[PDB]
Design a binder for this molecule. Structure first.
Ligand code: HEM
Ligand code: HEM
Ligand SMILES: C[C@H](O)[C@H](O)[C@H]1CNc2nc(N)[nH]c(=O)c2N1
Ligand SMILES: C[C@H](O)[C@H](O)[C@H]1CNc2nc(N)[nH]c(=O)c2N1
Ligand SMILES: N=C(CS)NCCC[C@H](N)C(=O)O
Ligand SMILES: N=C(CS)NCCC[C@H](N)C(=O)O
Ligand SMILES: [Zn+2]
Lengths: 411, 407
């Protein structure tokens, strides 16, 4: 079977065959679409098929399908699974795996970069201090004095589910959030629960509006331990505006390196529960969501006040006006300090080219419109007008529950 | 599968039970989501009619009544005999209001029960259709105090005698291809404009020429009519701050009136059923004015603003975009013509969702269509999970008549 997607701005029509290799389920049925829903012990029984599937893909990509090395590897993995109940990936397989999980990430607009990922193999890591060291190295490498480089660090795979490696932080670098007695929040409200945990674990909180959180790292299923990222490794950018000299006096900054650290990487049926990865920011991530979401820093009011906009009726679009200025400031500040960032126009345009290329050379590109379309100025970006098909391919990045909800405390 | 939806900004959680009444298909499967795809006999008829009459009698608290059973039997006898049936006026009004209620892509549904329904099933000719449409336009426009309305022409019989409005909206601006390659007026209507000219229309060839109506009664060849200009309310676009904005030469019409959809009630198909409410500002200022395939005015405006158009990261398009939409809203408000901004409209939709969930058990909603094309995440609907599914009565797409009509 074949499926057609149409761009309604250009009339370009593309044909998807790649969806036929989709195995996992979307959450939709014949009668209900769940396209806008945020979140819609593995035994020998299913493991080898999952392995074979991946190894077939790997060997096909390297033009060695059906070869002796291919057949020997399948044989080797089969015997290792029956003997040891799991298997270990070769380094080549791990790198391919990680790059493809990114490539298959339907919610990621930045996938044009997928093949230029730096993969750090941390499967020899045994302790939380070892994790801290690997993570510092990732941060220093990825940051690269502002010239950001995509990277992922991969900790040992899950075994029996009782010895998981986990990074308890949702991102490697994030600001603390503090709930005040009067109900207000100091810092980032998105991080209040995690902050409270850190403090309980013994973190001495500075209680400012932009405190970089400590790392909370769990090795081999043991209780997690606190570590402070050396401040010289945490690159930050003071936010100012090119025309508004009062903007700097809002006292805003942000960190340069976005590094998602709470997802699970699946490669050939193996589960990597600690696999922090990083690219670089699209401006709207910070300027629209981090700063302007009502449940985040929520700065629209204070910015609009300083702009002297008519804040009495919504139809003056005072929010829309302030939103644009804030986003200008974010991009201006990063560029001025020579820290990698991409605006939503450039990024979405690159994604369309990526997407078309993938259709031609791969037979498709799974994409989640709801996530791909930027949170401001939607229809003036080309992705708005692009039909997309969403489906699940492996290797993949998956959500997993926050560890504090599942961890069995040793004490 | 008694599903939940969460608002991630407010943590409000709603439980959906209404989806279990869904009938038709979404286009999605377990393996593939098609959420962003734009267009995804006697024995058939009676179940459809029954399902509908059942809802109707339940809604007036007479489910299982003699009158309910009587009506069921009566309709069954009429279908068996005539191969079709006719709706009572009360059933027609209920069905139309509920088709709107069920329109998962419509953000304006808080108003669903206030619809004025004009029964035009006695219409036989295109001249009669024109008259009904002029009356609709005048009633709906109401000197700028717009009122929601639908006019329903006779239902399909054998598909050889369809009533159709060839226009996509009752009021739209013409589009012409210029010798120099560019396009004058609205590029979306270049093909329709061609056909009008082909049919005898005398085009002023301006940037904002109101198209004529091409009206089809009983399957006959369609016929041209000019809407009385005094019936077409337009708004010249000016900016409250930029005096040069008026020089741009922009206007738009006050009445959005979708005329090319198909209304299905109780299995019956109404192929000509133009309806109208009032504009959300972004429809005009974002989509009509700033789409690259429409009036595409971004660079002219940014030029006048003296923005730095050398790099995309200056966000000049974004700045121009906001100003334009300020001007649209300002203008309509100043001329006392109903319009709603995207902030107000999305907030009322969240309220409407709350109401539906509580009193009806759900509200089918299409996130891709409901989230406005600008400033998405600063509107509450961005953070609202929505379940999309198909309920009847419904409005459906149908093919453009010219690709079908046997001349
Ligand atoms: C290199 C520049 C990159 C850019 C500009 C970019 C852009 C984005 C953006 C804007 C999102 C939505 C994030 C949100 O709204 O919270 C996203 C999601 C995502 N990205 Fe990328 N990304 C980049 C690199 C990467 C890399 C290196 C990986 C993995 C190796 C990756 C994997 C993902 C995944 C799995 C998601 C889904 C996140 C979720 O579901 O919460 N991205 N990306
Ligand atoms: C009264 C105020 C109304 C507002 C503010 C409103 C708002 C909207 C908006 C913004 C859209 C998206 C349209 C687009 O982007 O092209 C839409 C779609 C739609 N509306 Fe409403 N609407 C209103 C009244 C109505 C009425 C009276 C009906 C029917 C009786 C209706 C039925 C629909 C349908 C079926 C769609 C989907 C159209 C399509 O798929 O092309 N609406 N509405
Ligand atoms: C309810 C809705 O699915 C949710 O708010 C989504 C919408 N699209 C998004 N898109 C991106 N990139 N990031 C997000 O967090 C979200 N949130
Ligand atoms: C391809 C995509 O589905 C298409 O551009 C949609 C996106 N969402 C939309 N939303 C509204 N309200 N109106 C539209 O025309 C569209 N177009
Ligand atoms: N851009 C990336 C690639 S690692 N990460 C996305 C998550 C960051 C989040 N949106 C934020 O704005 O802090
Ligand atoms: N608001 C309504 C209720 S009839 N219709 C929407 C379609 C009009 C179109 N989006 C336009 O901007 O001209
Ligand atoms: Zn779906």
């Amino acid at each position: 079977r074949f499926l057609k997607v149409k761009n309604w701005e250009t009339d370009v029509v593309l044909t998807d065959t790649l969806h036929l290799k989709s195995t996992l389920e979307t959450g939709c049925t014949e009668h209900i679409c769940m396209g806008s829903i945020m979140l819609p012990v593995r035994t020998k029984d299913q493991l080898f098929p999952l392995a074979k599937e991946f190894l077939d893909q790997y060997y096909s990509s390297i033009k060695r399908f059906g070869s002796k090395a291919h057949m020997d590897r399948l044989e080797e993995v089969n015997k290792e699974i029956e003997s040891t109940s799991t298997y270990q990936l070769k380094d080549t397989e791990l790198i391919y795996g990680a790059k493809h999980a990114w490539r298959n990430a339907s919610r990621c607009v930045g996938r044009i970069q997928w093949s230029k990922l730096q993969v750090f193999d941390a499967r020899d890591c045994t302790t939380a201090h070892g994790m801290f060291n690997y993570i510092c190295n990732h941060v220093k490498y990825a940051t690269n004095k502002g010239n950001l480089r995509s990277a992922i660090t991969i900790f040992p795979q899950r075994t029996d589910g009782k010895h998981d490696f986990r990074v308890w932080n949702s991102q490697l670098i994030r600001y603390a959030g503090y709930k005040q007695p009067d109900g207000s929040t100091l810092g980032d409200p998105a991080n209040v629960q995690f902050t409270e945990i850190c403090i309980q674990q013994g973190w001495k909180a500075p209680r400012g509006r932009f405190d970089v959180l400590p790392l909370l790292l769990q090795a081999n299923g043991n209780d997690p331990e606190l570590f402070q990222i050396p401040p010289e490794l945490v690159l930050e950018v003071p936010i100012r505006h090119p025309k508004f000299d009062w903007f700097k006096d809002l006292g805003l900054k942000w960190y340069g390196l976005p590094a998602v650290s709470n997802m699970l990487l699946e490669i050939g049926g193996l589960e990597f529960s600690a696999c922090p990865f990083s690219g670089w920011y699209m401006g709207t991530e910070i300027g629209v969501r981090d700063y302007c979401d009502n449940s985040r820093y929520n700065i629209l009011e204070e910015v609009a006040k300083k702009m002297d906009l008519d804040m009495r009726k919504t139809s003056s679009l005072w929010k829309d006006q302030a939103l644009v200025e804030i986003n200008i400031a974010v991009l201006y500040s990063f560029q001025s300090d020579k820290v990698t960032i991409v605006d939503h126009h450039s990024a979405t345009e690159s994604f369309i080219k990526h997407m078309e290329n993938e259709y031609r050379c791969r037979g498709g590109c799974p994409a989640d419109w709801v996530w791909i379309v930027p949170p401001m100025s939607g229809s003036i970006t080309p992705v708005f007008h692009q039909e997309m098909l969403n489906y699940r391919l492996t290797p993949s990045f998956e959500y997993q529950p926050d560890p504090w909800n599942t961890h069995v405390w040793k004490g």
